[PDB]
Amino acid sequence: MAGAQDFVPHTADLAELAAAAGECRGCGLYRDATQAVFGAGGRSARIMMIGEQPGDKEDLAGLPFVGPAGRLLDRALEAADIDRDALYVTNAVKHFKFTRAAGGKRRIQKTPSRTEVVACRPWLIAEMTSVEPDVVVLLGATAAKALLGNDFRVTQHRGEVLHVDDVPGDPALVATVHPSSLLRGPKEERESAFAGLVDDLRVAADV
Ligand code: SF4
């Protein structure tokens, strides 16, 4: 077995899966991170949302999407008329990957390698098989690539309803921008990008 696969227990119970992920050594990222950050939500959710990895705040909160990026996504979900009872939100990698600077106000997130994404993917498959979502929203390049291939380009397929035969349960897949990209740039570009994120979320909610 490769990566996290022998660390994943034979259960679909999300509490048991989350506990087991706390003991995962499927790649090196568990060493420096505070804790594993599993997904949040319930198995009745119809929409699954996948980001890249927990960030500085999530690493310590023990919860996904608790910082500025989470607040922007919340603003977008509200504008797309998506109830939070319908969501299961998680990340492609479950340990924060980072370095620090000397005068930074945060620990600096680093990009997971394809090896780490592939190593952690067993947790994502377990989450997908446990929740059985009707649609999976892929927030950013790392998450999209995790399920759609290392060559996939979000910018080229944003907001298209995709279906790949290798994904368990054949949910609809919708790739979109990662909310953290929307925190930067000119006001009108952020406003334009925010409306496009809402669009992609509305496509997913209409699956
Ligand atoms: S990032 Fe994923 S595969 Fe790597 S140790 Fe953490 S939970 Fe396991």
Residue numbers in the entry: 1 to 207
What does the paper say about this structure?
UdgX excises uracil from uracil-containing DNA to concurrently form a covalent bond with the resulting AP-DNA. Structurally, UdgX is highly similar to family-4 UDGs (F4-UDGs). However, UdgX is unique in possessing a flexible R-loop (105KRRIH109). Our earlier studies allowed us to propose a reaction mechanism of UdgX, which involves the formation of a covalent bond between H109 of UdgX with the C1′ position of the target deoxyribose sugar concurrently with the uracil excision from this site in DNA.
Substitutions of His109 in MsmUdgX with Ser, Gly, Ala, Gln, Cys and Lys showed the loss of its covalent complex formation with DNA but gained canonical UDG activities. However, H109 substitutions by Gln or Lys, showed poor activity. Further, the overlay of all the structures of UdgX H109 mutants showed that the overall structures are very well conserved with a Cα RMSD of ca 0.2 Å. As anticipated, we note a clear difference in the sizes of the active site cavities in the various mutants. When we arranged the mutants in the order of increasing cavity sizes (left), we noted that the canonical UDG activity of the mutants increased with their increasing cavity sizes to begin with and then with a further increase in the cavity size, the UDG activity declined (right). It suggested that the initial increase in UDG activity (H109K to H109Q to H109G) occurred because of the efficiency with which the water molecule could be localized to make a nucleophilic attack on the C1′ position.
